[PDB]
Design an enzyme around this catalytic site. Structure first.
Site, mmCIF file in Angstrom:
data_model
loop_
_atom_site.group_PDB
_atom_site.id
_atom_site.type_symbol
_atom_site.label_atom_id
_atom_site.label_comp_id
_atom_site.label_asym_id
_atom_site.label_seq_id
_atom_site.Cartn_x
_atom_site.Cartn_y
_atom_site.Cartn_z
ATOM 1 N N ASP A 78 37.728 24.504 40.306
ATOM 2 C CA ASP A 78 36.370 24.291 39.807
ATOM 3 C C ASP A 78 36.102 22.815 39.532
ATOM 4 O O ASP A 78 35.006 22.317 39.787
ATOM 5 C CB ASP A 78 36.119 25.113 38.539
ATOM 6 C CG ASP A 78 36.158 26.610 38.794
ATOM 7 O OD1 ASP A 78 35.871 27.027 39.936
ATOM 8 O OD2 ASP A 78 36.471 27.367 37.850
ATOM 9 N N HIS A 121 29.883 22.677 29.722
ATOM 10 C CA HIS A 121 31.127 23.454 29.623
ATOM 11 C C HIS A 121 32.339 22.647 29.159
ATOM 12 O O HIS A 121 33.312 23.222 28.671
ATOM 13 C CB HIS A 121 31.468 24.130 30.953
ATOM 14 C CG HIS A 121 30.478 25.169 31.376
ATOM 15 N ND1 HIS A 121 30.077 26.194 30.547
ATOM 16 C CD2 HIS A 121 29.817 25.345 32.544
ATOM 17 C CE1 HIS A 121 29.202 26.954 31.183
ATOM 18 N NE2 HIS A 121 29.029 26.463 32.397
ATOM 19 N N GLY A 176 34.162 24.426 34.421
ATOM 20 C CA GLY A 176 32.922 24.787 35.090
ATOM 21 C C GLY A 176 32.149 23.608 35.655
ATOM 22 O O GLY A 176 30.965 23.446 35.363
ATOM 23 N N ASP A 207 20.122 27.092 30.698
ATOM 24 C CA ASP A 207 20.937 27.276 31.897
ATOM 25 C C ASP A 207 21.249 28.756 32.065
ATOM 26 O O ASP A 207 21.220 29.511 31.094
ATOM 27 C CB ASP A 207 22.249 26.505 31.742
ATOM 28 C CG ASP A 207 23.026 26.385 33.039
ATOM 29 O OD1 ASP A 207 22.960 25.309 33.668
ATOM 30 O OD2 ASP A 207 23.718 27.352 33.422
ATOM 31 N N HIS A 212 24.110 29.892 32.561
ATOM 32 C CA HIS A 212 25.401 30.096 31.913
ATOM 33 C C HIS A 212 25.388 29.722 30.436
ATOM 34 O O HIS A 212 24.615 28.867 30.004
ATOM 35 C CB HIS A 212 26.481 29.279 32.621
ATOM 36 C CG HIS A 212 26.627 29.596 34.077
ATOM 37 N ND1 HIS A 212 25.961 28.896 35.059
ATOM 38 C CD2 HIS A 212 27.367 30.531 34.717
ATOM 39 C CE1 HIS A 212 26.288 29.385 36.243
ATOM 40 N NE2 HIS A 212 27.139 30.379 36.063
ATOM 41 N N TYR A 267 21.854 25.323 42.264
ATOM 42 C CA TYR A 267 22.626 25.239 43.498
ATOM 43 C C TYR A 267 21.827 25.585 44.758
ATOM 44 O O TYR A 267 22.362 25.603 45.865
ATOM 45 C CB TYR A 267 23.908 26.064 43.362
ATOM 46 C CG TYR A 267 24.643 25.713 42.082
ATOM 47 C CD1 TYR A 267 24.515 26.499 40.945
ATOM 48 C CD2 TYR A 267 25.418 24.562 41.999
ATOM 49 C CE1 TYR A 267 25.165 26.167 39.766
ATOM 50 C CE2 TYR A 267 26.072 24.219 40.823
ATOM 51 C CZ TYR A 267 25.941 25.026 39.711
ATOM 52 O OH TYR A 267 26.586 24.693 38.540
HETATM 53 C C1 LIG Z 1 31.421 30.411 46.747
HETATM 54 N N1 LIG Z 1 32.378 29.606 46.004
HETATM 55 C C2 LIG Z 1 33.255 28.696 46.720
HETATM 56 C C3 LIG Z 1 32.444 29.706 44.651
HETATM 57 C C4 LIG Z 1 31.594 30.581 43.989
HETATM 58 C C5 LIG Z 1 31.650 30.695 42.606
HETATM 59 C C6 LIG Z 1 32.554 29.934 41.880
HETATM 60 C C7 LIG Z 1 32.594 30.078 40.387
HETATM 61 O O1 LIG Z 1 31.826 30.856 39.845
HETATM 62 N N2 LIG Z 1 33.448 29.349 39.677
HETATM 63 C C8 LIG Z 1 33.593 29.396 38.231
HETATM 64 C C9 LIG Z 1 32.923 28.125 37.717
HETATM 65 C C10 LIG Z 1 31.399 28.258 37.737
HETATM 66 C C11 LIG Z 1 30.762 27.105 36.975
HETATM 67 C C12 LIG Z 1 29.244 27.240 36.852
HETATM 68 C C13 LIG Z 1 28.690 25.908 36.366
HETATM 69 C C14 LIG Z 1 27.302 26.054 35.796
HETATM 70 O O2 LIG Z 1 26.345 26.251 36.526
HETATM 71 N N3 LIG Z 1 27.203 25.934 34.479
HETATM 72 O O3 LIG Z 1 25.976 26.036 33.837
HETATM 73 C C15 LIG Z 1 33.410 29.054 42.536
HETATM 74 C C16 LIG Z 1 33.353 28.942 43.923
HETATM 75 K K LIG Z 2 22.238 28.890 28.644
HETATM 76 ZN ZN LIG Z 3 24.790 27.154 35.059
#
Ligand SMILES: CN(C)c1ccc(C(=O)NCCCCCCC(=O)NO)cc1
Ligand SMILES: [K+]
Ligand SMILES: [Zn+2]
Ligand SMILES: [K+]
Length: 366
Positions: free
Chosen positions: A89, A131, A139, A166, A168, A294
């Site tokens: 990540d 995060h 993250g 957000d 998350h 994204y």
């Molecule tokens: C398709 N692909 C290669 C992936 C898809 C999902 C993740 C993931 O969820 N990883 C866990 C970390 C997610 C962090 C989200 C950050 C965010 O938007 N925070 O608000 C990883 C790779």
């Molecule tokens: K949030």
């Molecule tokens: Zn997010």
């Protein structure tokens, strides 16, 4: 001090463009803002780079020095790195320390502008990395700029409200201030078994002297503008009356927007815009941050629209950006249409959550 501060420089955007998970997003965001000429209505401020001491106001020296170390060459094979949260990540890409110091410094600069009374609203669309932990990347976040910004604001403002819209949970910011009553964190987020980062149920309210000074609103897939705003307004209304904040830090990650590969919420920037308006009418010093997002074109669409909301401007529907015009295909308009999929939120559950929070906030007395 009526014109918003816009944190920007070509070097800063160039650095932010280098993030593995969001390549060139910072350029697309600024480009659209620029194409609508919104930056001409704002005070453009070049971000200072955060010093080691400034970053150490939250992060441990051990983490910072390790990050600095692996960043020098981009060593993605260091033994200690996994325990510092570096990995899949959060890769140890080359220059990541300088990138993190730039983002941290940008948010700090925005906070300093607010303190000095240069503006009432300062914007860092490339910040919002909520995060990051004291000594752990997490993250896609290598440094918690939001925490750094809040700490800077505390030099002048007594109580800080952090609002996190957000997709998350803003766990890193919540954890950093879990022990105190001087900063309240409010997060609206998807909450489902296995969904990152897994924390932030309505029962999560903070610890010790910080008990009831953390607010969490667990939400399910498919929520749209109207219902989201109803929830957000009710919570923020109660929070404002009970906590009486002196300054606000607002994280506006665009991964809630329809068309985002996260494919969870079903929002448009208009809905988020309404939440933003409600916060703005408090007329408090407000630090605006980005976050996740994204679908790069939609994220640009969203934050450009929100910048317009901050400026009280109505924007033309036709996309004026020539450089990234093709990314806005096939329809090339600023507006975003919600997807066709169900709202999974049961009204009884939402009401339970709202009731619970109202009960929690009754403990909050200034
Ligand atoms: C398709 N692909 C290669 C992936 C898809 C999902 C993740 C993931 O969820 N990883 C866990 C970390 C997610 C962090 C989200 C950050 C965010 O938007 N925070 O608000 C990883 C790779
Ligand atoms: K949030
Ligand atoms: Zn997010
Ligand atoms: K707190």
């Amino acid at each position: 001090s009526l014109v918003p501060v816009y944190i920007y420089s070509p070097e800063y955007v160039s650095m932010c463009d280098s993030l593995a998970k969001i390549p060139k997003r910072a350029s697309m965001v600024h480009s659209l803002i620029e194409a609508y000429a919104l930056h001409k209505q704002m005070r453009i401020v070049k971000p200072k780079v955060a010093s080691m001491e400034e970053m150490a106001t939250f992060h441990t020296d051990a983490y910072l020095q390790h990050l600095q170390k692996v960043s020098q060459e981009g060593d993605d094979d260091h033994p200690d790195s996994i325990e510092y949260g570096l990995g899949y990540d959060c890769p140890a890409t080359e220059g990541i320390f300088d990138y993190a110091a730039a983002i941290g410094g940008a948010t700090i600069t925005a906070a300093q502008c607010l303190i000095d009374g240069m503006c009432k609203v300062a914007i860092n669309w490339s910040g919002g990395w909520h995060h990051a932990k004291k000594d752990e990347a997490s993250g896609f976040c290598y440094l918690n700029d939001a925490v750094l910004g809040i700490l800077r604001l505390r030099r002048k403002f007594e109580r800080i409200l952090y609002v996190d819209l957000d997709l998350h949970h803003g766990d890193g910011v919540e954890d950093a201030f879990s022990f105190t009553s001087k900063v309240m964190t409010v997060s609206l987020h998807k909450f489902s078994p296995g969904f990152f980062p897994g924390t932030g149920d309505v029962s999560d309210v903070g610890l010790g002297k910080g008990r009831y000074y953390s607010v969490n609103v667990p939400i399910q897939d498919g929520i749209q503008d109207e219902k989201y705003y109803q929830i957000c307004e009710s919570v923020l209304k109660e929070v404002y009356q009970a906590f009486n904040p002196k300054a606000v830090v607002l994280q506006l990650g665009a991964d809630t927007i329809a068309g985002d590969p996260m494919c969870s919420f079903n929002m448009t920037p208009v809905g988020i815009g309404k939440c933003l308006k409600y916060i703005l009418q408090w007329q408090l010093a407000t630090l605006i941050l980005g976050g996740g997002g994204y679908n790069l074109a939609n994220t640009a669409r969203c934050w450009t629209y929100l910048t317009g909301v901050i400026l009280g401007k109505t924007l033309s529907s036709e996309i004026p950006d020539r450089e990234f015009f093709t990314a806005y295909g096939p329809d090339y308009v600023l507006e975003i249409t919600p997807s066709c999929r169900p709202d999974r939120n049961e009204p009884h559950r939402i009401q339970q959550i709202l009731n619970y929070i109202k009960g929690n906030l009754k403990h909050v007395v200034i």
